[PDB]
Amino acid sequence: DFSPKEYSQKLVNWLSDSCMNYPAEGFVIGLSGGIDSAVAASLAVKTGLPTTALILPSDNNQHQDMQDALELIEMLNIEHYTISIQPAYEAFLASTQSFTQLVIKGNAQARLRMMYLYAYAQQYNRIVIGTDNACEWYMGYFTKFGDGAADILPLVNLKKSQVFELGKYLDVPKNILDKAPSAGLWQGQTDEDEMGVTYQEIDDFLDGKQVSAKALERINFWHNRSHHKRKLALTPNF
Amino acid sequence: DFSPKEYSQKLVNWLSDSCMNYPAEGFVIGLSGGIDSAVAASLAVKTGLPTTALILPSDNNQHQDMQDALELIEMLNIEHYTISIQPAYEAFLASTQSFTQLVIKGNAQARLRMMYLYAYAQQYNRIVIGTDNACEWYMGYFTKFGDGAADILPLVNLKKSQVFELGKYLDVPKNILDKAPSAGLWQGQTDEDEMGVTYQEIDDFLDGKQVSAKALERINFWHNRSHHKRKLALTPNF
Numbered sequence: 145d146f147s148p149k150e151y152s153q154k155l156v157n158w159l160s161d162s163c164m165n166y167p168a169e170g171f172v173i174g175l176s177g178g179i180d181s182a183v184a185a186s187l188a189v190k191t192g193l194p195t196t197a198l199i200l201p202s203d204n205n206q207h208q209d210m211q212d213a214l215e216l217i218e219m220l221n222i223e224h225y226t227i228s229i230q231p232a233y234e235a236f237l238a239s240t241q242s243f244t245q246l247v248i249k250g251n252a253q254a255r256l257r258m259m260y261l262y263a264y265a266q267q268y269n270r271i272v273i274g275t276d277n278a279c280e281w282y283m284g285y286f287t288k289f290g291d292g293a294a295d296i297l298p299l300v301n302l303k304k305s306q307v308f309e310l311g312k313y314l315d316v317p318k319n320i321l322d323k324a325p326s327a328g329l330w331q332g333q334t335d336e337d338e339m340g341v342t343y344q345e346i347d348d349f350l351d352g353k354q355v356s357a358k359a360l361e362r363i364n365f366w367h368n369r370s371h372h373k374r375k376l377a378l379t380p381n382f
Numbered sequence: 383d384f385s386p387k388e389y390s391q392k393l394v395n396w397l398s399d400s401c402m403n404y405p406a407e408g409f410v411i412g413l414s415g416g417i418d419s420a421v422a423a424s425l426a427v428k429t430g431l432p433t434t435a436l437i438l439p440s441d442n443n444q445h446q447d448m449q450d451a452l453e454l455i456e457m458l459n460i461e462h463y464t465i466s467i468q469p470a471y472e473a474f475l476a477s478t479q480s481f482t483q484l485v486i487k488g489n490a491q492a493r494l495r496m497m498y499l500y501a502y503a504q505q506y507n508r509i510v511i512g513t514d515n516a517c518e519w520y521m522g523y524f525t526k527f528g529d530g531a532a533d534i535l536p537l538v539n540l541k542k543s544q545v546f547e548l549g550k551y552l553d554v555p556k557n558i559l560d561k562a563p564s565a566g567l568w569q570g571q572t573d574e575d576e577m578g579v580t581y582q583e584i585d586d587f588l589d590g591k592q593v594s595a596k597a598l599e600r601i602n603f604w605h606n607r608s609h610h611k612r613k614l615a616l617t618p619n620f
């Protein structure tokens with residue numbers, strides 16, 4: 145059925161109860177300047193529990209995305225830290241020379257962000273909010289043990305269009321509502337160009353609506369190759 | 383009903399089939415110089431599929447543990463790399479200054495090792511073998527998204543004594559058989575001192591055998607504080 149006001153209150157209540165029962169003090173989240181993290185952070189703040197945002201740029205990230213995240217942080221009035229992952233990434237990369245890719249880079253960088261978030265989380269007894277929505281989950285458009293690694297996933301049942309509706313309801317900065325969804329691996333990269341299918345097509349597919357043959361091919365391809373990303377590690381039946 | 387020979391062959395067959403069906407070309411494993419990773423590496427090698435070992439010391443690690451891992455690699459005749467994680471760890475740790483203890487250090491290093499393993503695996507189409515045995519799993523004595531993060535867990539149904547039995551059967555070097563189980567964070571650190579409970583006690587508990595009230599107090603304390611380490615992230619049911 146979905147309406148932003150009601151679904152937002154249910155999520156706020158579920159985050160709050162989940163955090164108290166965990167048990168933990170509050171939340172930490174990575175703020176990319178994108179819509180999923182903007183929405184998840186806004187929801188976490190409404191619980192009234194301590195919420196901290198990390199901004200973790202690499203050199204491939206855009207200044208506007210940093211500024212959009214900072215603007216949200218100002219509006220939300222939350223504790224925050226901005227730390228470049230680039231020096232750690234560069235040291236890690238250099239140290240891999242004896243056995244050496246853009247995807248390999250993207251995945252290392254996601255895992256470095258996980259390390260920052262869990263470092264903070266352990267210091268302040270927080271839980272880490274993962275921002276995966278239903279489209280990213282189904283497509284496996286996330287890094288295993290990177291952005292796919294979290295304690296709690298408030299958006300994972302939401303269509304992208306529902307994420308946007310929550311954004312509008314929650315007064316997320318306009319530029320976050322209007323910008324192209326992007327992993328931020330290079331300037332001009334967009335999720336939809338990378339996937340070869342639009343979010344509207346994925347959402348329609350999730351809804352059991354007709355999509356084109358090419359959309360369906362891409363949806364099936366992404367979903368098929370990502371089965372292990374969604375499940376626990378394989379263990380013996382003996 | 384455990385027998386080293388029979389179980390070993392079952393595990394080797396399962397590793398092989400699991401890897402073939404993944405699909406992947408082979409394995410990668412972090413070798414600490416301890417028994418769990420020694421046994422897991424030996425099993426992987428027996429599948430006849432490409433198997434690479436990474437040795438990933440930090441300055442906290444004991445030189446003997448690197449030497450024992452190297453000794454095993456020589457015996458197994460496998461591709462391997464020895465890479466200090468210290469440069470990457472120091473860049474990471476320095477960068478956390480604004481918000482930032484030994485447990486946190488230990489956890490960051492374990493997640494760095496995860497990064498190395500996955501960087502290799504993705505470059506060479508391998509799957510990452512996790513070395514968690516039934517004791518570590520139950521006690522949650524592993525880092526979430528560090529050594530607890532892998533593609534496949536061949537040892538996770540095994541008691542520590544059964545891991546050692548496999549070690550003996552697989553001709554793992556004597557010093558690895560005889561040394562104290564240890565996370566390697568400082569000289570003289572031992573798992574049993576850390577947990578306050580012996581592996582024999584944990585193993586007996588897992589088997590439904592009587593243990594002391596002291597033992598049982600340490601077992602439930604560890605198991606209780608780690609419920610979420612074993613499971614997937616919390617998701618809404620709505």
Ligand SMILES: Nc1ncnc2c1ncn2[C@@H]1O[C@H](COP(=O)(O)O)[C@@H](O)[C@H]1O
Pocket residue numbers: 173174175176178180181198199200201202205257275280291325326327328
């Ligand atoms: N530069 C960044 N700073 C902080 N968090 C980030 C950054 N880039 C990505 N993330 C986190 O990673 C998640 C996945 O991003 P995306 O790949 O665009 O779906 C985001 O929702 C953020 O929580």
Ligand SMILES: Nc1ncnc2c1ncn2[C@@H]1O[C@H](COP(=O)(O)O)[C@@H](O)[C@H]1O
Pocket residue numbers: 411412413414416418419436437438439440443495513514518529564565566
């Ligand atoms: N120095 C190291 N080099 C490579 N892998 C390691 C090292 N230390 C720990 N590991 C990995 O982490 C796993 C867990 O170690 P432990 O914490 O001793 O149970 C080991 O089985 C290894 O696979």
Ligand SMILES: [Mg+2]
Pocket residue numbers: 178180181275276280
């Ligand atoms: Mg996203």
Ligand SMILES: [Mg+2]
Pocket residue numbers: 176178179325326327328
């Ligand atoms: Mg993004």
Ligand SMILES: [Mg+2]
Pocket residue numbers: 416418419513514518
């Ligand atoms: Mg171990």
Ligand SMILES: [Mg+2]
Pocket residue numbers: 414416417563564565566
């Ligand atoms: Mg060890």
Ligand code: NA
Pocket residue numbers: 325326327335
């Ligand atoms: Na994205």
Ligand code: NA
Pocket residue numbers: 416563564565573
């Ligand atoms: Na150990």
